[PDB]
Symmetry: D2
Subunit: 380 residues, 4 copies
Amino acid sequence: SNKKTKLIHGGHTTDDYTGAVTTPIYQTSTYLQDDIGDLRQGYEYSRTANPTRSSVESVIATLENGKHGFAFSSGVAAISAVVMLLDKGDHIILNSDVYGGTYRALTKVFTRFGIEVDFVDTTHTDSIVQAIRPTTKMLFIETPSNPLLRVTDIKKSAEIAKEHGLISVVDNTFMTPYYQNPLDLGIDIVLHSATKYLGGHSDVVAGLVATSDDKLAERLAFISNSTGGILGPQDSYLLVRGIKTLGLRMEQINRSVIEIIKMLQAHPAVQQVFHPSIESHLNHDVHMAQADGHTGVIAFEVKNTESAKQLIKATSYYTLAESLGAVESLISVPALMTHASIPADIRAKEGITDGLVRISVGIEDTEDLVDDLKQALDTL
Amino acid sequence: SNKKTKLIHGGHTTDDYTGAVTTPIYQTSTYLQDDIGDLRQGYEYSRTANPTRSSVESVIATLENGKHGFAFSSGVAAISAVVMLLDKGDHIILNSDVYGGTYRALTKVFTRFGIEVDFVDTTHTDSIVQAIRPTTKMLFIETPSNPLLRVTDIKKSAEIAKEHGLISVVDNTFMTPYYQNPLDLGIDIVLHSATKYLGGHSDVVAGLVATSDDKLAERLAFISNSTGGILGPQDSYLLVRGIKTLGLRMEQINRSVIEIIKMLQAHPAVQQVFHPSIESHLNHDVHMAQADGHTGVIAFEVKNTESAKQLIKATSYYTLAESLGAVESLISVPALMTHASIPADIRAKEGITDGLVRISVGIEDTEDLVDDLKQALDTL
Amino acid sequence: SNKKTKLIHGGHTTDDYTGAVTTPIYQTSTYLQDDIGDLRQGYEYSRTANPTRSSVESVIATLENGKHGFAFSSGVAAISAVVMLLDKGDHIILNSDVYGGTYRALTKVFTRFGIEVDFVDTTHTDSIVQAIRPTTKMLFIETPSNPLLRVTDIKKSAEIAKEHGLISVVDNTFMTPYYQNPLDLGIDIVLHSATKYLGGHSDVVAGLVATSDDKLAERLAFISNSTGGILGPQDSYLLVRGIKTLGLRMEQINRSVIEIIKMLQAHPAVQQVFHPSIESHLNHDVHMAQADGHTGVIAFEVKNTESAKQLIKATSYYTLAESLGAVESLISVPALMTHASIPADIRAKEGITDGLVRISVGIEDTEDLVDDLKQALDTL
Amino acid sequence: SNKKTKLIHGGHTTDDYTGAVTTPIYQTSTYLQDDIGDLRQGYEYSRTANPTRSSVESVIATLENGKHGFAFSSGVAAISAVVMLLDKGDHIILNSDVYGGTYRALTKVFTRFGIEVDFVDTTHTDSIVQAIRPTTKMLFIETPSNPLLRVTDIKKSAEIAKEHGLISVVDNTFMTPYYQNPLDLGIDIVLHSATKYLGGHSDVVAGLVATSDDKLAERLAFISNSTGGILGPQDSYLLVRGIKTLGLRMEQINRSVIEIIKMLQAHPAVQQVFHPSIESHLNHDVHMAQADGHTGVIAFEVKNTESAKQLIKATSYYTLAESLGAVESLISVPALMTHASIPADIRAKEGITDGLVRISVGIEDTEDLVDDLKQALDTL
Ligand SMILES: Cc1ncc(COP(=O)(O)O)c(CNOCC(=O)O)c1O
Ligand SMILES: Cc1ncc(COP(=O)(O)O)c(CNOCC(=O)O)c1O
Ligand SMILES: Cc1ncc(COP(=O)(O)O)c(CNOCC(=O)O)c1O
Ligand SMILES: Cc1ncc(COP(=O)(O)O)c(CNOCC(=O)O)c1O
Ligand code: NA
Ligand code: NA
Ligand code: NA
Ligand code: NA
Ligand code: NA
Ligand code: NA
Ligand code: NA
Ligand code: NA
């Protein structure tokens, strides 16, 4: 049973009652009880459980080879729920190039709650060991990262976490369960911004979490019910729907990624390309050992900010917008958009050069995408 | 101008573009930018803002005579966002009768983050003054309370909070903006489980928050954006739709409440009755001075839990389920359902006895509701 | 038992499986079969049946005291389905004041299929008897009519239709089942533009049909299934939700209607007033004998079309738009908007003059609605 | 600009106002007018136009290389609207193996309206010429047909229709605009059951129509507005969404179709296979000349009804359900399901043998689909 089949038949996404081939949308808040505490299908209040959300949860658990799924109103909310597994005084290590909003949440919210943070370049696993204190309880890793796609050894970070008694969390958003399964490599918790590839259609903001640990799942459920950043039923339905085409979409995206990178490597206006598919990429071997495909986010550097802006205006099929994982291919300038608050000279130290472009490859025709970007690069 | 008109025309709930009479459902995650940083209507990512969510936010702000609305995935998520205004070491005062889940969240979650909580009988405002510690930063009041309907003097608690530098928060869920407007009495933040009267149809789980404080609004926006417990667009739409009928629904409910209370006060199988409309009810004067109506939540004592169970089975129009503020009239035993997370000995001390019944009066015919409940109580 | 209770508990609008208090939205097209021909709940293809559509159908059947409900994509589609009960050569009688689009559909579409139509002044039932041809198979009545609110004797027209073997159809859109129940007076089929009062929130375009005739129901089901103008599940859900508040909304509307009519009768810039509540209105006795209330549609004459235009601009709470039965109060000029498809000379003969204004009274405050309309008419 | 790009960027499917990357869902019934007849974006009533429906219409028009799109509540409703282009006395020719519901509508509804019908085996174009009377106004062709996939020469049928003054209609449902574009070959009107491949997710019942003829479009619009079988906004949104993945889905489906047919042709329990991809198939050359891909519906004959039933029970990834074009692969027995009313001996004359199986190939893994069906055929 291969992935494209599991996508279609994995999880519970039909109606046992009527036999509907799609998950009913339970736009509802409460459920009648036959007697006090006697729930006929286990439902009592939609913050606690909702049959549509339970459906999407079952899907994410199945695809990530876990036992328990959780759906939150945003990826940010999923991350918050996971971090609220810790107490004041606990210490968490994250990779240093973590997504802007994850950094913002750990440093201007959860530090105010007495949670200690260390940001570490996890491209070398031993930096994690250097960072481990006796109060360390959680290790949190994106791979690949935004926007330079730095790869981290998932299996090694799981071994480190196991031996030091840490909760290991991988943020699988850029790879999707279709290409990378952190739970299979020993990670405790895997989470996604379902806003991207999973939803797939730029029409749902949601986060998903999956684990095989029963006691971790029980704590996650308690947090979800007591802080309430749950995904609504309509968005859960749209998420299930979106996930159906995930394999086909990721494979189209990957075909275009490969051709686009060959174009970028051959082009003169491009000084450097960041993507784990490139054999000179740091930890390319590690990535190929922990995934059987690629993310569709690519970064490449052109000479300056005005060649970036000109590339944006010269493209016909790349769309200037926030986010990634859309059907549309998206384009952006991290120096002017996501990393604008970071000053110029320090963002050169960080790698966010003035001419760094990030594309999120969509499901348009591969030749249209390659050709369009190449003619734009020929205008420079 | 008048309340029933304000419900229809207050806030922005039409489409400027097409002239549509109802708020469009912007089931979307991202927005096109004309130039880098150039947003056509101020939208760039749906976690940050979404036109349908902004519609509901504008409605709740208008109705509570504040300046800023916020829509969360649940009332519990609104409460979480407000509590995250505090830091480790800060102390919060709440009133002694609180919704089960608010108690659970503050005592089993935010204490782990070093936030101190004390539950204080605010029916006498001066008890707040004694309870204020030097680390007290927030005062949080339900009024009337769930499930005993204890009244607290909102204007007095606002004066106290101003004089000691506390953020005053009122949880106006039971009264709705139709009858009670805490911001107009000096409160800093007003909160709702929009799951109840506002949504009105048992089909949306959501929270709403409103303030006139610009800097509190900015901190709330930062929290919502960094933890992501945002209300989705479909639920935001359904909330606006529901809020339209709010006045008509509350006025039916009040008509029915009056007759049901006279019935309960006269009935032999009914012991104590809890509702602020009763002249012997503690702080009844206070309630009539701060509200223009009554909540539809009523609590009353029967002899024991199995007389509760039999009363529940004998009713034909009261539905055994959690939550309140629906069109259906609802019935429950708070000790065994909504307030089970409150410890037993405290629930006995407070009066939330095993035979305490809570009804939420709906919009069915008043005579059907009175007769049905009375014929059922004649069974005991 | 009583109407306000029937609105809440009549029909099947809960989930038997999970106990959900609201009708699930079965956004689905097909259903699993356990064996060939073995349907788990009787569903096999969503054009034929859909559980959410069946929910709304059960509601309208219950409310109209019939046995069979039908949900169409629009009221016009319900009318089409009913007219398709006839064959080429059959003759239908309609009342002389009909909604613009019903006129357009019967005279510009179904005549091309050899269906003969005659518009007859049914305010005197005996005019029907003269109009009956040997090819007459159907009698079709709006009451009150759009936009002149002409009353027709429903019980008398049913007796006539029974005695001559005609299918009697009443278009109960203006009255709603809350106030008038044609099936209870012998009519065969009752029809609604559910777009109006039933939906209630200007957010659903839909039609509903109800009958107790088993064989008419079977022919209607065959027509709906073979021409496919079925109501979708999301709109069916929103219709159920809307119908919940129908009694409360109609009762507000009626309270406002009474005061607005006294204002209009007294105003100097207002000539004739059309509404069945007026004692001098033709067949006012008849209306009070067949209904327990009044529609919120009022028509009245101002001097000319530009006094209409100025009255429209001067109002603050009346909205210039098509349709009726919304929470917003609406205002229009039928001659130039809804009834423009009716030929001009017939519209002048009938009284649908260029200065005929139609308001649909909404649920805003009665005093705001009276004062606003009167201050605007003081402008002429 | 290749097909997979056109799918993503063809048509208007973003919000000009806010810049949302997806079509807003206009759950609304009416739109305010600035003055009488002055519509700010051309909208006045949602039966007439609705921005979400206008979006989907634009998509279908673009993909079929037409100028005008129309969205109906069902494919059946689209077909009815097209047939209502004719008048009593007009004559239409359809292919003899037309879909059950199209046959049912033409013969038990539209014949009652004086429309004459001839059902003709259009696999030889000259049978059309034999059938042409002087009253013939319309030619209506499915290709390939259900369930034996008979191919008809589209370009030739267009030439015949042009020379005899007929409205040519092709029912492109089985091929989708991705593989066959009848308008490009001279056909006047092309229609789809969007319930199948276009929607793609078994969650929308809808029909779509596309033409380049301005006067035909004007008539179609008049019919749509006066009979009202319009697609609702939520289903239009879901249709746009579904159409995004159409190319990827059709290509996966086609890869599996080819492998599955090689398996079926090689298997002993299979006596005969029906699919236009087979070179011995009647008019295979014609199909390859008018399409650049294949439908995913395949028929094959096994010995008897009990080998069909056993094949259904023995498969793990083929699902017994009505309809086609799902993500799930579907399986059925036409003799016992769609063609059950037709007697046994005459269905042998028709080709609907007792052992005829129809599969609708989904987007599961190709090897899982081939293997699963082959092991089932090895159980016979
Ligand atoms: C790992 C991870 N988690 C979370 C997120 C975001 O989570 P959420 O779904 O709440 O937006 C992102 C992406 N955030 O991008 C927004 C942008 O491109 O401006 C992400 O990469
Ligand atoms: C006063 C109050 N505030 C806040 C909340 C939290 O709201 P939410 O459930 O939307 O998260 C609730 C939730 N009540 O729910 C079940 C019940 O008591 O019958 C509440 O009652
Ligand atoms: C009495 C009546 N019946 C039937 C119908 C048809 O209903 P629908 O628009 O849902 O197809 C209508 C539609 N009215 O619409 C605009 C207006 O008159 O203000 C109607 O008024
Ligand atoms: C050409 C065509 N038009 C129309 C249709 C059906 O149109 P609609 O979308 O109204 O179902 C079909 C398929 N109908 O199948 C239903 C089934 O498999 O039982 C079709 O092939
Ligand atoms: Na399954
Ligand atoms: Na493990
Ligand atoms: Na307004
Ligand atoms: Na203030
Ligand atoms: Na019922
Ligand atoms: Na009868
Ligand atoms: Na476009
Ligand atoms: Na042409």
